[PDB]
């Protein structure tokens, strides 16, 4: 096919933060097409994978990934807190985060 | 909030070897029960000499609407105090119940006349059973015959951050 995308796309935004103290445990995620929390409830628990490049070829491929889940809803507009294993670099606020579809429970 | 309107009846306590006092009754409009009993004490201290502990309270009721789908007209006598003592006031309110009027009155008292929920004391509310007893012009503005107006320049609220439409009122 032309389009093999199996994953909704999204934007990384912030770490969770107070007005001053951030808490870079849990990235906050914006999801494309979710405008509302009850839309979120579908996504909670899928596997987010942040994907980027490294010019030094590591495993035989220069494309690297961090994985992680999506835990709970955030705010009324449908931000969704995700926590990766190794926290997102904060180099990327507003970079495209991919939200796969599985675990699949419907 | 949504108001609810409580019939309230004090027995206020009978003295020694004196039975069954005069069982005062009032209609208070609150948003819940405790606010009511709060008032019924509050006013009832003033309306003649008593005291909270000295008295008692018996009956409480939520008096539902009479006929909630009949559009009804009202007029209302207010006592509210600012800066100095009150000025007893009167209005007319066109709405679908007793409660809806009372509410709208509160919002209005907050919108202009600047006296808060402690201060306002409903004296009496009444439906206007015929027409033409309606003096205030803004009310009977709608009492005319064959009444029509359009949407005053419809404002649609789009739920996205982009439209391609160059939207129109229409």
């Amino acid at each position: 096919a032309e389009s093999h995308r199996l994953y909704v796309k999204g934007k990384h935004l912030s770490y969770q933060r107070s007005k001053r103290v951030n808490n870079p445990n849990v990235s906050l995620i914006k999801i494309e097409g979710v405008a509302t929390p009850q839309d979120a409830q579908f996504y909670l628990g899928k596997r987010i994978a942040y994907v980027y490049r490294a010019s030094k070829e590591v495993r035989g491929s220069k494309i690297r990934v961090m994985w992680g889940k999506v835990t709970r809803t955030h705010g009324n507009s449908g931000v969704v807190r995700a926590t990766f294993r190794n926290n997102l670099p904060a180099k990327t606020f507003g970079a495209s985060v991919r939200i796969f579809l599985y675990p699949s429970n419907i | 909030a949504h108001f609810k309107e409580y019939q309230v009846i004090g027995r206020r306590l009978p003295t020694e070897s004196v039975p069954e006092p005069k069982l005062f009754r009032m209609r208070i409009f609150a948003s819940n029960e405790v606010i009511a009993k709060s008032r019924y004490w509050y006013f009832l201290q003033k309306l003649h000499k008593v005291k909270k502990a000295s008295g008692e309270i018996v009956s409480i009721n939520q008096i539902n609407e009479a006929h909630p789908t009949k559009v009804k007209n009202f007029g209302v006598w207010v006592r509210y105090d600012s800066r100095s003592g009150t000025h007893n006031m009167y209005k007319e309110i066109r709405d679908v119940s007793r409660v809806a009027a009372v509410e709208t009155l509160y919002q209005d008292m907050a919108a202009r006349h600047r006296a808060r929920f402690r201060s306002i004391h409903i004296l009496k509310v009444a439906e206007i059973e015929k027409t033409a007893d309606v003096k205030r012009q803004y009310v009977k503005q709608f009492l005319t015959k064959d009444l029509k107006f359009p949407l005053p320049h419809r404002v649609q609220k789009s739920t996205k951050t982009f439209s391609y439409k160059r939207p129109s009122t229409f």
């Binding site: - | 789908t69 009949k70 559009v71 709405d95 679908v96 709608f142 029509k148 359009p150 949407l151």
Partner: protein, 137 residues
């Protein structure tokens, strides 16, 4: 020519006996009609037909419609029903292009994946025909 050019701007008008499409509530996309008017904002709506309970409403929640009929001042449930079907507004409504649209996206919503695949292959064929036939002149 001597007839004037003043015109037209014919819009929807609040008035008794106007079917309104309620856009949010427990109705959320049904029809009712305006019994009678309270003031610049609040009105009293109902129809027993589409199920909407008769209630006050603040016009924000509700969009007017091109369709209306005739009806007394402060009518009632049964009445508004009899006048309703008497006016056959349901037929009239659904006949329109508007309601065709609402029904359209409603159904496109319900497409099963496989159904959606049907839709792919068909539109491929149909497209191919229109392209064949067109661009021959």
């Amino acid at each position: 020519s001597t007839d004037s050019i003043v015109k037209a701007s014919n819009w929807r008008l609040v008035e008794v006996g106007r079917v309104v499409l309620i856009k949010k509530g427990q109705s959320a996309g049904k029809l009712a009609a305006i019994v009678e008017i309270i003031d610049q904002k609040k009105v009293l709506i109902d129809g027993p037909k589409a199920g909407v309970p008769r209630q006050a409403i603040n016009l924000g929640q509700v969009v007017l419609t091109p369709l209306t009929f005739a009806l007394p001042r402060g009518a009632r449930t049964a009445t508004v029903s009899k006048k309703w079907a008497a006016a056959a507004v349901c037929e009239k409504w659904a006949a329109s292009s508007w309601a065709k649209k609402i029904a359209q996206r409603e159904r496109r919503a319900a497409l099963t994946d496989f159904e959606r695949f049907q839709v792919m292959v068909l539109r491929k064929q149909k497209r191919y025909t229109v392209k064949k036939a067109l661009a021959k002149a």
